[PDB]
Amino acid sequence: KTFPDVPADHWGIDSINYLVEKGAVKGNDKGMFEPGKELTRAEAATMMAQILNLPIDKDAKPSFADSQGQWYTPFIAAVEKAGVIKGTGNGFEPNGKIDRVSMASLLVEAYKLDTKVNGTPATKFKDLETLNWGKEKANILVELGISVGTGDQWEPKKTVTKAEAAQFIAKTDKQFGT
Template identity: 40%
Template sequence: MLRIRLKYLVLLPLLAGFLAAQIVQAATAPPGSVNNPVVSRSYVEKALQPLRDEISRLAAEVAALKAQRAVKFDDVPTTHWAYDSITYMVNKNIVKGVGAGKFAPGSQTTRAQLAVMIVNALQLPTTGVKAEFTDVPASHWAYSHIAVAQKAGIISGNDGKFRPNDSVTRGEMAAMLVRAFNLERLNKAARFSDVQPGYWAYDLIMRVADNGISRGYEDGTFRPANKVSRAEVCVFLALSLDPARRK
């Protein structure tokens, strides 16, 4: 009997040391672990904070997206073929409505208006530059934007004139987009039956097509002399600005 008691006495120091180690380990182990199963509320709050922060960030992004979708014009329903591009451009403050809740998507775009949109899209500074076109006086509403676009090599004119109030054509728009966004010729298979080599904008139109900004019409034409509507401008510019939108 004495031998058995002595045996347990020998084990007591070992057991005490083991228990002490467990106590230290529990004190330093994170709550909820095997060594420290008790979870305090403060620990849970701290552990969940990164998750709360991420949820808040995602909620803000969702709210921003909803705000974008909230842009509404009476004449641009969600079913309009250019609705997404118009919404994209409006939310970037590149283009605005025409007033009274209207956007006038089918209205033609003037050369001055397109110059303004492109300058806004590129966020070019519009101070300290002078236009050199004889038909664009300093009093013109788009003077500074036209001056900047001219200096940047985005626009040009004939006989010293820009013709700011003329409706822009699809060929002219292609030329402005190529110069504004430095579109390269990729030599893809895109061809248009009404745009042949030798046409003044042939290479420019091919660059726009190569980069997925325009595929032309279903009948295989590009119709470079057609006037460009406000809706079309929004689509072309949105595709130029955001390559991810190209398909």
């Protein structure tokens, strides 16, 4: 599968090709990959369900009142069942944009990445030093070289694009998928 908006020598091409092969990403009706498109939490959850080859049962429902009655519902059901996501009494917000720290959480839970590091990873970014949720998860991605360091900020609240998500997921799955 080739995409006009992801040329052969463009970053993300190998990651994207891997996910296409695994049935975990696609382009749109126009043939476009839309690499810069900001992903929703449901879209990220779906990519995860597909790459992990979780059983998708069309009638399965996740716990969350906010994630029913839509295309994403059985995918959210699958990822919840697998423990890739949990609930924190506050729904899943499927149509909210996913941020880097939430993506880190999906990856760490899906691949049990805490079991792939020795001890507790150091904090290498000032914006992780006092982060109130997800610090340990971000620190694991850093320790494993899955993220993406660009200075003194990890940018935990920054939204994740489709191509960025493809990179995180392809790299992690190729390394730790079972």
